[PDB]
Amino acid sequence: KVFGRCELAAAMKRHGLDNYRGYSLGNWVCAAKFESNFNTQATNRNTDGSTDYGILQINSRWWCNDGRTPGSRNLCNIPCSALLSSDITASVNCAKKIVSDGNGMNAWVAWRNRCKGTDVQAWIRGCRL
Ligand SMILES: [Cl-]
Ligand SMILES: [Cl-]
Ligand SMILES: [Cl-]
Ligand SMILES: [Cl-]
Ligand code: NA
Ligand code: NA
Numbered sequence: 001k002v003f004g005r006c007e008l009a010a011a012m013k014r015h016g017l018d019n020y021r022g023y024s025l026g027n028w029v030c031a032a033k034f035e036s037n038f039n040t041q042a043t044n045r046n047t048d049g050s051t052d053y054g055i056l057q058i059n060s061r062w063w064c065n066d067g068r069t070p071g072s073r074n075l076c077n078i079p080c081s082a083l084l085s086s087d088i089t090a091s092v093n094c095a096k097k098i099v100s101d102g103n104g105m106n107a108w109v110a111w112r113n114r115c116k117g118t119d120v121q122a123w124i125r126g127c128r129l
Contacts, residue, residue, distance in 0.1 A: 001039075001040045001041075001086035002037070002038055002039045002040075003032075003038040003039075003040070003055070004038070005029065005033075005038070005123065005124075005127070006124070006126065006127035006128065006129075008029060008032060008038055008055070008088075009025055009029050009123070009124045009127050009129060010127065010128075010129055011088055012025060012028050012029070012088075012092065013025055013129050015088070015089065015092040015093075016092075016096075017092060017095070017096075018129075020096060020099065021099050021100060021104060023099065023104070023105055024120065024121065025124055025129070026120030026121045026122065026123040026124045027105055027111065027115060027120045028056075028095075029120075029123040029124060030111065030114070030115035030118070030120050030123045031056060031105065031108050031110060031111040031115055032055050032056055033123065034110040034111075034114045034115070035052075035055070035056055035057035035108065035110050036054065036055045036056070036057055038055065039055070040054055040055050040083075040084055040085060040086055040088065040091075041054075041084050042054065042055070042057065043084070044057065046059065046061070048061065049069060049070070050069045050072060051066055051068075051069065051080065053066075053080045053081070053083040053084060054083030054084050054085075054088075054091045055083075055088055055091050056091050056095050056108070057108070057110075058076070058080075058083055058091060058094055058095070058098070060072055060080050061073070062075055063075050063076045063094055063097075063098065064076055064078050064079065064080035064082075064083060064094070065078070065079055065080060066079070066080040066081070075097065076090075076093070076094035076097055078090055078094065
């Protein structure tokens with residue numbers, strides 16, 4: 001599923017991401033834009049052999065099981081393929097664990113490099129929330 005900008009913002013708010021650990025909703029929408037272009041099916045390989053899955057590009061090194069990332073963990077206790085569903089619940093719930101892991105949203109390098117220090121509220125401008 002490819003979400004609209006405001007459709008995704010609404011779904012993330014409904015799931016409690018708006019100011020979760022102090023990150024306003026625009027941070028999450030900005031991260032999703034640059035991680036997946038709002039596409040739940042997005043997958044991308046990392047140099048170490050792990051893979052990133054779904055709308056927030058959650059990686060198989062630490063957070064999910066894809067059966068092909070040797071030496072990895074599965075801290076969200078989910079198959080990585082569940083993160084490609086049109087229902088973003090698993091991605092949001094896993095994201096809540098990630099962002100609570102010490103480094104905040106710096107865990108998403110695209111957030112650090114493209115969203116941090118910018119006017120992230122722009123990403124929800126015009127949206128009925
Ligand atoms: Cl957009
Ligand atoms: Cl914020
Ligand atoms: Cl959903
Ligand atoms: Cl933080
Ligand atoms: Na915001
Ligand atoms: Na894994």
